[PDB]
Write a protein that binds this ligand. Sequence first.
Ligand SMILES: CCCCCCCCCCCCCCCC(=O)O
Lengths: 110, 273, 53, 132, 262, 235
Amino acid sequence: QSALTQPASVSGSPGQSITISCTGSSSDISDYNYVAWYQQHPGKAPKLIISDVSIRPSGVSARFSGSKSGNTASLTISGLQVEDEADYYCSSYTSDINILFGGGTKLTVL
Amino acid sequence: NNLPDTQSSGPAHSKETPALTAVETGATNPLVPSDTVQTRHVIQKRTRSESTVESFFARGACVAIIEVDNDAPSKLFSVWKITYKDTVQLRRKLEFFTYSRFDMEFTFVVTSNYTDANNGHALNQVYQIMYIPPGAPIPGKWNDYTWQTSSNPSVFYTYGAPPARISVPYVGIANAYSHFYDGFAKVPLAGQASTEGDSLYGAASLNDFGSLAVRVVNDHNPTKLTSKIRVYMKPKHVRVWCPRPPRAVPYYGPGVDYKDGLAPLPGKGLTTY
Amino acid sequence: GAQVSSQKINYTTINYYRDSASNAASKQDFAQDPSKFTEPIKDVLIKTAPTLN
Amino acid sequence: QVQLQQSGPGLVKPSETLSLTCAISGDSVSSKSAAWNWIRQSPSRGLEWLGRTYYRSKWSHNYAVSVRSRVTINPDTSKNQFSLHLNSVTPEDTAVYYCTRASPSAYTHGWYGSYYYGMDVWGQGTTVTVSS
Amino acid sequence: SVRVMQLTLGNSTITTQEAANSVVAYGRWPEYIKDSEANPVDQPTEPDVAACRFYTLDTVTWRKESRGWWWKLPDALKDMGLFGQNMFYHYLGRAGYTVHVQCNASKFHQGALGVFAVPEMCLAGDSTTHMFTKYENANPGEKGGEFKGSFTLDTNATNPARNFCPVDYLFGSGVLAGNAFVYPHQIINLRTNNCATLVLPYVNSLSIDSMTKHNNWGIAILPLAPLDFATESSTEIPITLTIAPMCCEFNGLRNITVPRTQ
Amino acid sequence: GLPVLNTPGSNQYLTADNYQSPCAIPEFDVTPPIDIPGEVRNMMELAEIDTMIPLNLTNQRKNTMDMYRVELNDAAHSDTPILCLSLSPASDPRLAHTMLGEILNYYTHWAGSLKFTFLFCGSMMATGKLLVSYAPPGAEAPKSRKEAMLGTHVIWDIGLQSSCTMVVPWISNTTYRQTINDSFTEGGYISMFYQTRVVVPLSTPRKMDILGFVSACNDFSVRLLRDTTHISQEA
Ligand SMILES: CCCCCCCCCCCCCCCC(=O)O
């Protein structure tokens, strides 16, 4: 089975810029822009941040944004702050009526 | 455009036999009635005018159905990808041939209806349509800055007016359109495990023709309304260069795959009229 | 700059938009030939040319 | 605004049958522009999708290939609730479970309609344990 | 008369005395590119007889219950000497093809075969996922493949084969086989003839294309009447195939390519 | 001289009209064409081609490659028929699925003559004779050689050339036909019969196979377009 790939972990300092990428086989991402992102916090249920590559729902800051097509989707962050630390997961919807998730990204601070 | 007439012929006696041949050469004997039976002098007037390709394609047919809403805050705008593969009526006719070349024409229809007249009543409506060539930015909201359309053509339609109509020329990058492609966009080279060179069989160019966007201009009424849009297409100035046999099983995906409907022929006796 | 033709009693036609794709259709062609089996024309004698460039 | 709620047994024994029900508040289950999905999360495996159901002039179902025959989901119009049923329970089933909602994306068509990329509303998460 | 012909090039020699008439696809003879229809600008190369010669492929066995065979071009010729060498160095290429099938038998044998030539001959997969077939299986080389008598889906979702599953009476693309006679074709009957010949020009929407990505012509073979003989035990006879291109040229020279294979 | 006054029936949308319309991409650049084999300009160029026929169509052979073949044997002489067909291309299942029938399904009227061809796939040493018949309507369907030999028929001799052709003349009381299996516009019947038994020497297979083809003629025509029923609209 094709499965999405994510970097293990990344960290930085406030005020900087961050980039993350999710990549997988052609059958999962190369068809169209069926891509979405989710975030989670310790003891918290997952929360939506981005849907359809670049569309930001209500209440989402302009800092979080990213987009590309093909074999990889990139998420970019500006004006980094402490509260931005979280867990990140990529998702996709295929033509076979199925939904897939990546291995996840782990960023946590005590 | 006339047709050939039929001349008279009487009986014959010889071993000049045009009724014997060999099909192994892949050729057809152009026989006629007069060479095997007695005939009378007749004059024809029938013609082949209704058999031309231009008259064969001189009909408009539906392609897509779109939905959109109008409310204060459920979706306020929508997008559709341009392609003729979503329906079978025109697709089956087009798959008669391998390559094609023609101009194209468009037409739009609008409809609307209430959900509940209990809250009040609302005034007339206005709809907007814009064309997005490949590579252009996508709108992010019903009120985005991208709707200024300083270069992208856009059309405005008023509810109750007669349908709009549009024409465009041939815009292919090759010398003709291609309905089949037995190949790949990429070639996998050595030193590459899974992620490089992986591509789908029959893939087309990076981006074919872009998409269309729709929205409503009037501000939200204190009650919800619903609307739909339909599209019709009409070719003209057509040409073709290679035939193919027609489809005989249900379509399944853009490709030639099949997984059902594999028994179209019924039973019957061998000596029944 | 009008053009006239028979309906089969004539009719008239005018073009307003100066773009071919905006023009209407016509029915002016009837050529047809189904012979697509074999052809003998292949040989021409080039090297026997009395002329050179 | 619209909020979900989870209910059902939290403990299971091997070979038993497990069923859960999620409640909708502030919305109608028969909504013609919504969908409902089931998800489970476990540290050893992460996130994964199970199935979903929706009503469009008729009832319909969609299930994951890997566990298609082991899963059954049924609605409840009177309660404004939808219920899950799972059989052949085993220790691996010990994980967190949520009920969620999906909203429509905007590219439309394919098989006539629109596409539902993912989810926006999430439940609290109800834990299921298999022991003995 | 038409029962005898001669075709032989490049230090080989064969015997032929019962060929039927020849066939030309749509009555067009191959030619070089004209100055009024080019698109590149660099000076091309023309190997001439260095690549325009007959090549011999592998042999196969015809049995009573055999189903059919299929090949792709120019994939099959990638490993034949200088033609294959040039096909990998240059980025672009163009060429026609010529075909000849060989098969002989006795008088008491009876049977029939069909030959079809198809441009842009696409085929169906074997899995639910749309267009999931892989490159390495759709370009197998000279051996070709064979049709199947029924349709069956795979179940190994973890390690899918990602292969074709053509059906004989569907012609591998969901259309009836009897209607395929609209293509160029020849028919072999063991009681009248013993070989077939065809001429194929270059057909495409462009004057020239990349040879590594796109295949123009395809070839299929289907038995129409089963082989039979008074021998009650078993019977087999061979089939051999020959191909030869004409009017070759190339453009865009760079370092060599080496495709991945499994 | 007509600023605001009345007008006749207008503002409707009709799918078969022909008008000028504006262009949305002015001053565009067009790629020139080139010459390619197979330029097609009339559909009748496709009706003049032979095609196979699924004659057998039995329950154990339909949807299989075996339904295209027929079997013959060298038993003694008899007058019983081998096979039968009715001339109804647009409604007969044995012909509706061919190229000719598939094209005709998009049209409503047709007229002209038709040709039929047969091919013998036996060994060289085989010998025999056969008969083919065509009988216009208006009486009991023929079922014996004596009854068929009164109407149009042809004698076929097997030899060094294995193919033969038979022609269906245009005989009708109307200028066109309906294509929808109507009694008032029936087309007749077709049949085949033995003429002499088949002769085979020793050390030879005792079974033979025969194939058929159908094609149109040069006077065929069609004059009205419609939609097909093989797949349908929905509301
Ligand atoms: C790098 C790949 C090159 C492929 C050749 C270009 C032609 C294909 C791209 C356009 C897609 C065609 C879609 C159907 C056309 C139509 O009928 O409108």
